[PDB]
Amino acid sequence: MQIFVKTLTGKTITLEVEPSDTIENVKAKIQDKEGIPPDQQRLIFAGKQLEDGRTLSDYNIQKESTLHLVLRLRG
Amino acid sequence: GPVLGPTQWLGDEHIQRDYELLAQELQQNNPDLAARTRFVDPLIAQMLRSPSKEVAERALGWVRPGTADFLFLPVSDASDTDRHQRGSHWSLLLVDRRDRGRRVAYHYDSTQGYNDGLAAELAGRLDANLQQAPIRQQQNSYDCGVFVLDGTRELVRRLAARPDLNLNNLVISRQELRDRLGA
């Protein structure tokens, strides 16, 4: 199935995923296209950050959902 | 966790975890004030200033400002675009919406003026007038995130009691923060 990942600049990354895919698997798929290491990524859905060990289906993320990518912060 | 070293810069993971702890504490001790208050995820706070208005309006819908009296936003200066610029500094914006006609965003920066550009962007997106607010200034190169977190907790205590928003007398404790996150 298809999901979309929206960047802070508004760019859309299109991923091909399964409901059984872990969040970590999704971050790897983002790395495959953008080159961003998974340890720098955060993924947000419905206002909540997604934990690397859960699956898409755990968060009720279904076909054509949009996730938001925000890279890690420090200061 | 996440655990935090003695001189380690705070990441968004440390700020968010303490904000979750605080959010749960407040809903237990003062559920009425907790319903009126948003402790905004630092990542969502950056989305609020996104150059993409579709991204910002999503972040606005998660914050739900229209029903809040107070918004606490950790302000990072990380880049929106550059993967290699993940931030240098944390500051705190408290938006007081109680008077829906003159909302004010109080900016507490432990290096005065550092994040003022970004603070003004956030306040504009939240329909607030920016006002620099006093906080004790940092004495080392690593504790700005602790000023943000302990400043938030002290302000919450002051808002519960009726007021004084001067944080010049703020006492911070990295030790107590490391204990909160580690437990």
Residue numbers in the entry:
A (entry chain B): 1 to 75
B (entry chain A): 828 to 989, 991 to 1011
The authors write:
NopD, an effector protein from rhizobia involved in legume nodule symbiosis, exhibits deSUMOylation activity and, unexpectedly, also deubiquitination and deNeddylation activities.
XS1150) NopD complexed with either Arabidopsis SUMO2 or ubiquitin at 1.50 Å and 1.94 Å resolution, respectively. The C-terminal carboxylate group of SUMO2-PA or ubiquitin-PA can thus be crosslinked with the active site cysteine of NopD (Cys971) to form a stable covalent product complex after incubating NopD with either SUMO2-PA or ubiquitin-PA. Our structural studies uncover that in contrast to Xanthomonas XopD, NopD shares the same binding interface for ubiquitin as it does for SUMO. Another interesting feature in the NopD-ubiquitin structure is the presence of a strong well-oriented electrostatic interaction between ubiquitin’s C-terminal Arg72 and NopD Glu840. Glu840 is a unique trait in NopD essential for binding to ubiquitin, as observed in the complex structure engaged to ubiquitin’s Arg72. Notably, our functional analysis indicated that the NopD E840A point mutant is only relevant for ubiquitin, in contrast to AtSUMO2 or AtNedd8.
